[PDB]
Design a binder for these strands. Structure first.
Ligand SMILES: [Mg+2]
Ligand SMILES: [Mg+2]
Ligand SMILES: [Mg+2]
Ligand SMILES: [Mg+2]
Ligand SMILES: [Zn+2]
Lengths: 148, 38, 216, 147, 98, 130, 122
RNA sequence: CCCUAAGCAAUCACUUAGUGGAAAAGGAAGUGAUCGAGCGAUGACAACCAGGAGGUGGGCUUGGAAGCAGCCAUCCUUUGA
């Protein structure tokens, strides 16, 4: 939780592998789990928690502005992607090997087809516009998803 | 003239025109809307 | 008594096309890729009876354009809850009809990124066959409901409900009327109006929809 | 007759008390319009009625400083919040009901609202449904009979 | 026979236009220390009238329209008071000079 | 679907119709137009209807009112006289032109007993009474 | 519309199936915008029983009359060439009012003469 | 093709950027192929012409807010609209 920025409160280990992220898909296809509209990724890659929260804030602000009164709060968002992998880094003027560096942030590994956000309680046009607004905060190619 | 990578129509009087192999946005109403891709 | 009751939705005549298929000589990723390069979706026609030893299976290929058009026009869930006529010919535009069957599309695999069709599965449904079908829900009367007039929001908990259905009277959708719903109370799966020959597979105490309290 | 209409202004003046300065001041002074003949013709019309009736006038202003104005009986808003109750409509109409009126006051106002100069061929059911719409606009509730 | 016509308007205090030699030369006064002289091309002729109005005639539509464009480009209209050279049917949209 | 309206409106309009004509409604204000429609409905029994030219005739095709097809050009209002009293129905529009001074809006063409009479021709039929 | 004309005389047989252009021209020229541009103009309508073809015959401000084939051409085409001929007569006018001879004439060989670009010079 | 030994090789398509012969998000929508969707002689699109109304200045807010600062309602009528 922790309000806006999403990462684990604690982890079993502090320092993780780099891993490989350029591959991976959903082998059975993807369907929305909670909402009527959604954003899924088209590529596989890494998303920082700051980028996920920027996209969520863009969707929330667009729903807050485009709708007013009683339907302003009736738009609901689900965040299906969670940055649970810590990344580390080393400072400048430091030579190569004296152990792993200190953790610097959190990332989420995304596969092809993986649903990132889900939306309900809004119109289709507002869902499309919020999906367009959220895609500019993300370094991966995304697509608008509709329940059918 | 506004020079940017993402040129847009920003009103109903904005037309896209291609001149000398370059994309321009011309506007009969608002001269602030005049753009060149680059 | 194996007919759709009056006042209940029936499958639409507009989407009652015949799905055209040609036989397929093999299975695997190689021939599937070669078929998708030729504009066809690999498929299979089988039946319930001998699930071991295959189901009297016939391997076929269907056109990508027809499958894509049907899935786009109907919707994903509406495609999977509606019977179709499947015609199998020796080649595209021939006359040697190999099989003409009334089958339910049991599953369809769309690509996770591009949503192109990769596989369509048809199960033979002659009259008197009982199939487990996920029927999509259509919610009407939300503009009449007192709960949503007061500014409360709709929590749609389920979009499809699983039913054991005789093949004759599989509903294309179930209309859920929300008009007598004010703030707080909910509908369960037992509140859905169906044919008496349809059986709920999941328990009747499963919430379908709930009008939750709007923020004062 | 042939004049291209320069302007058309609506105007609210209580019945018979048209002293041309507070409501008939800048409203006609903005468009060169004369005051004396307009006021004498207006008070020569709304003399048959009780004073302090918030009567509405539409002035068709012209370029030769000529007048062909139409005087209209007051709004159905005033007719409904005088024949129902308080003179304060709802803050959030359709959420906070203020006063309730059945059908008969609606019928009498519809009898009044047919006497306008351009409503001779409108039927009373039409005006009645319109009055229900105006009532719903204000938070005023509508019923069958109050007891 | 000259079929094509295009009419220019001169707006501005002290601004003048004057044709010289059977329409083969145009002279403008545009607030400078000198006169601006334009040589009228072949198959184009120029005239000036008692409305501070320039007229461009001729038999080639391209040359007449281009010469009218050149004359307008000598002093295109400015946005604050509408002074300069403009087409007769051209609408200039003004803005408030603070 | 908007043509289903016109088909139904003229179907109800032709149930007791004896007479179809047209009025050129150029320049008429909305208040003038509604006033003429209301005058024609209480002083006479005739219903006025503005519609497409191509819909009205298509609901007058294979019908008694079949040969009107040439007189279906221009901004037209269709005056379905649903009574028998044609003289009063024609006299009230003459009174309308005299009183309101609208001489650009004329009666153009008519069909009675399957005969297209000119505006020269259906004037003595206003002159005769009953 | 009516800024070059002084009479619009339109006649058509009422029953003939080619009356569309004439009645549409009556729609164009009897408008509120049209008669506030020339209240001095006359619009004459002649309804006739005989079978002459429909004819729109206008005359201009300088006495020039130019008839039209109303049964074969649309009212927008009639309006377009009325605008063109009226503009041409207005151009010819201030030409004669300012002492210039009309029509202005040039020899038809200066097209083949080379024309260098017009550079304004002091 | 020449430099450079051997084809201005053959057939059907595509591009006109010297792309080919370096470079992403994003923009623009050139030019083809296939499948759809919607509207269309019941006359569509583009163009020209004429209207675009009445309850009503909806209620609140409010120095004023009258279709159009802001909040709530957003119905009805006559209509070709
Ligand atoms: Mg295998
Ligand atoms: Mg060699
Ligand atoms: Mg290169
Ligand atoms: Mg590139
Ligand atoms: Zn613009």
């Amino acid at each position: 939780k922790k309000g806006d920025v999403l990462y684990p409160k604690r982890t079993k280990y502090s320092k993780y592998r780099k891993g490989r992220c350029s591959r991976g898909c959903k082998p059975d296809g993807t369907k929305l789990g909670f909402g009527r509209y959604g954003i899924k990724s088209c590529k596989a890659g890494r998303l920082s928690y700051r980028a996920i929260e920027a996209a969520r804030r863009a969707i929330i602000g667009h729903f807050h502005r485009a709708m007013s009164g009683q339907f302003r709060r009736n738009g609901k968002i689900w965040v299906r992607v969670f940055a649970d992998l810590p990344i580390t880094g080393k400072p400048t003027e430091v030579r190569m090997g004296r152990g792993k560096g200190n953790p610097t942030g959190w990332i989420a590994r995304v596969s092809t087809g993986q649903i990132l956000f889900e939306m309900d309680g809004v119109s289709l046009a507002n869902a499309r516009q919020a999906a367009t607004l959220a895609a500019h905060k993300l370094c991966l190619s995304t697509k608008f998803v509709q329940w059918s | 003239m506004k020079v940017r990578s993402s040129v847009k129509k920003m009103c109903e009087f904005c037309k896209t025109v291609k001149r000398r192999g370059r994309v321009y946005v011309i506007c009969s109403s608002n001269p602030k809307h005049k753009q060149r891709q680059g | 008594q194996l007919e759709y009751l009056p006042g209940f939705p029936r499958p639409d005549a507009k989407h009652a096309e015949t799905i055209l298929a040609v036989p397929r000589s093999d299975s695997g990723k190689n021939i599937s890729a070669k078929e998708r390069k030729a504009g066809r979706v690999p498929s299979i026609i089988f039946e319930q009876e001998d699930g071991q030893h295959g189901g009297n299976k016939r391997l076929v290929s269907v056109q990508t354009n027809q499958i894509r058009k049907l899935v786009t026009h109907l919707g994903y869930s509406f495609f999977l809850s509606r019977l179709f006529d499947v015609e199998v010919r020796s080649e595209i535009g021939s006359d040697e009809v190999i099989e003409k069957v009334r089958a339910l599309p049991r599953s369809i695999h769309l690509h996770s990124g591009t949503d192109a069709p990769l596989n369509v599965t048809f199960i033979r449904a002659p009259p008197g066959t009982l199939l487990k079908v996920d029927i999509p829900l259509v919610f009407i009367g939300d503009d009449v409901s007192p709960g949503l007039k007061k500014g409360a929001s709709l929590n749609t908990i389920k979009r499809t409900v699983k039913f054991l259905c005789p093949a004759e009277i599989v509903p294309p959708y179930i209309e859920v009327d929300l008009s007598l719903l004010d703030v707080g109370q909910k509908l369960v799966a037992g509140d859905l109006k169906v044919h008496p020959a349809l059986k709920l597979i999941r328990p009747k105490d499963e919430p379908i929809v709930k009008i939750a309290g709007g923020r004062v | 007759t042939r004049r291209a209409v320069a302007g058309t202004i609506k105007l609210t003046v209580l019945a018979g008390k048209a002293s041309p300065g507070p409501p008939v001041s800048p409203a006609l002074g903005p468009y060169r319009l004369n005051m004396m003949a307009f006021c004498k013709d207006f008070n020569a019309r709304t003399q048959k009625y009780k004073p302090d009736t918030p009567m509405a006038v539409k002035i068709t202003a012209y370029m030769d400083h000529s007048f062909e104005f139409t005087f209209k009986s007051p709004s159905v808003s005033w007719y409904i919040k005088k024949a129902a109750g308080v003179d304060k409509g709802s803050t959030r109409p359709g959420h906070l009901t203020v006063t309730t009126l059945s059908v008969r006051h609606v019928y009498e106002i519809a009898k009044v609202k047919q006497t306008d100069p351009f409503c001779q061929y409108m039927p009373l059911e039409s005006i009645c449904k319109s009055i229900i719409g105006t009532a719903n606009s204000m938070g005023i509730k509508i019923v069958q009979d109050l007891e | 026979e000259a079929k094509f016509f295009r009419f220019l308007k001169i707006v501005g205090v002290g601004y003048k236009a004057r044709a010289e030699e059977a329409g083969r030369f145009l002279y403008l006064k545009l607030g400078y220390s000198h006169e601006v002289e334009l040589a009228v091309p072949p198959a184009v002729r120029v005239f000036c009238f008692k409305n501070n109005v320039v007229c461009c005639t001729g038999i080639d539509k391209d040359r007449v329209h281009q010469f009218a464009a050149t004359v307008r480009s000598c002093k295109p209209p400015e946005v604050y008071k509408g002074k300069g050279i403009m087409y007769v049917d051209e609408v200039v949209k003004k803005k408030v000079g603070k | 679907r908007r043509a289903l309206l016109v088909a139904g409106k003229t179907k109800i309009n032709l149930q007791n119709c004896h007479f179809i004509t047209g009025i050129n409604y150029n320049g008429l204000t909305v208040k003038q137009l509604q006033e003429l429609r209301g005058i024609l409905r209480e002083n006479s029994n005739t219903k006025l209807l503005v519609a497409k030219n191509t819909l009205v005739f298509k609901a007058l095709e294979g019908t008694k009112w079949e040969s009107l097809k040439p007189c279906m050009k221009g901004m037209n209002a269709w005056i379905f006289v649903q009574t028998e009293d044609i003289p009063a129905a024609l006299k009230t529009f003459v009174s309308f032109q005299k009183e309101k001074k609208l001489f650009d809006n004329n009666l153009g063409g008519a069909v009675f007993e399957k005969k297209l009479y000119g505006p020269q021709d259906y004037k003595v039929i206003e002159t005769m009474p009953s | 519309m009516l800024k070059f004309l002084s009479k619009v005389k339109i006649e058509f047989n009422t029953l003939d199936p080619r009356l569309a252009s004439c009645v549409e021209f009556l729609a164009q020229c009897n408008a509120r915008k049209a008669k506030e541009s020339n209240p001095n103009c006359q619009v004459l309508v002649k309804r006739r029983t005989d079978d002459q073809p429909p004819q729109i015959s206008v005359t201009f401000v300088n006495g020039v009359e130019e008839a039209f084939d109303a049964a074969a051409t649309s009212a927008q085409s009639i309006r377009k060439m009325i605008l063109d001929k009226g503009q041409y007569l207005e151009t010819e006018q201030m030409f004669r009012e300012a002492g210039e001879q009309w029509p202005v004439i040039i020899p038809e060989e200066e097209i083949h003469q080379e024309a260098p670009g017009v550079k304004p010079r002091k």
